[PDB]
């Protein structure tokens, strides 16, 4: 296996529209065929793997590390796609190593792998007006007025993902 693309999210229909499931939403735009493999939905394409862990958001390392270890996927070929409160909706940024900047899904993968040196695709979702409501904000759906931006973010993310996988 050449690489591993991980979409951050939570399992179950009740989380499917929430901001914290934006990484699953990107993965779901890729055209792939996901199959259940333990606490994970996994797809194989282009010589590599795509993973929607069903571990819960903060526990995704539990699915990522056994897969990476087993197929000897190096951290340079692991990409973690996730929602990011520190960037405004509409903004997308790649990140190579460095701190799991308080993203607990990225943190759980660092913990389980024993390294910070994997890549992340950060998808800005903005912040809530009050910091203490962060969990609430990410476990809410987007506002209907955000949907046009969200769509275009998903389109841009889908291209970024394939670019990272493929040509660049």
Author numbering: 0 to 167
Quoted passage from the original study:
Peptidyl-tRNA hydrolase (Pth) hydrolyzes the ester bond between the peptide and the tRNA of peptidyl-tRNA molecules, which are the products of aborted translation, to prevent cell death by recycling tRNA. Pth releases the tRNA from the peptidyl-tRNA, by cleaving the ester bond between the C-terminal end of the peptide and the 2′- or 3′-hydroxyl group of the adenosine at the 3′-end of the tRNA (A76), and makes the free tRNA available for further rounds of protein synthesis. Pth1 adopts an α/β globular structure and functions as a monomeric enzyme, while Pth2 has a structure similar to thioredoxin and acts as a homodimeric enzyme. Here, we present the crystal structure of Thermus thermophilus Pth (TtPth) in complex with adenosine 5′-monophosphate (AMP), a mimic of A76.
Thus, we next used a C-terminal α-helix (C-terminal 16 amino acid residues) deletion mutant and performed crystallization trials. Instead, we obtained crystals of TtPth in which the C-terminal three amino acid residues (Arg165-Glu166-Gly167) of a crystallographically-related neighboring TtPth molecule penetrate and interact with the active site cleft (A−C and S2B). Hereafter, we refer to this structure as TtPth⋅tripeptide. The TtPth⋅tripeptide structure showed that the tripeptide, Arg165-Glu166-Gly167, interacts with 7 amino acid residues in the active site cleft (Asn9, Tyr14, His19, Try55, Tyr56, Asn57, and Leu138). In addition, the main chain carbonyl oxygen of Arg165 forms a hydrogen bond with the main chain amide nitrogen of Asn57. Furthermore, the main chain carbonyl oxygen of Glu166 forms a hydrogen bond with the side chain amide nitrogen of Asn9. In addition, one of the C-terminal carboxyl oxygens of Gly167 forms a hydrogen bond with the side chain amide nitrogen of Asn57. In terms of the crucial regions for the substrate binding, the Cα atom distances of the closest residues between the gate loop (Ala100) and the base loop (Asp85) in TtPth⋅tripeptide and apo TtPth are 9.26 Å and 7.69 Å, respectively. The cleft between the base loop and the gate loop seems to open upon peptide binding. The crystal structure of TtPth⋅tripeptide showed that the C-terminal amino acid residues of a crystallographically-related neighboring molecule bind to the active site cleft, in a manner mimicking a peptide moiety of the substrate.
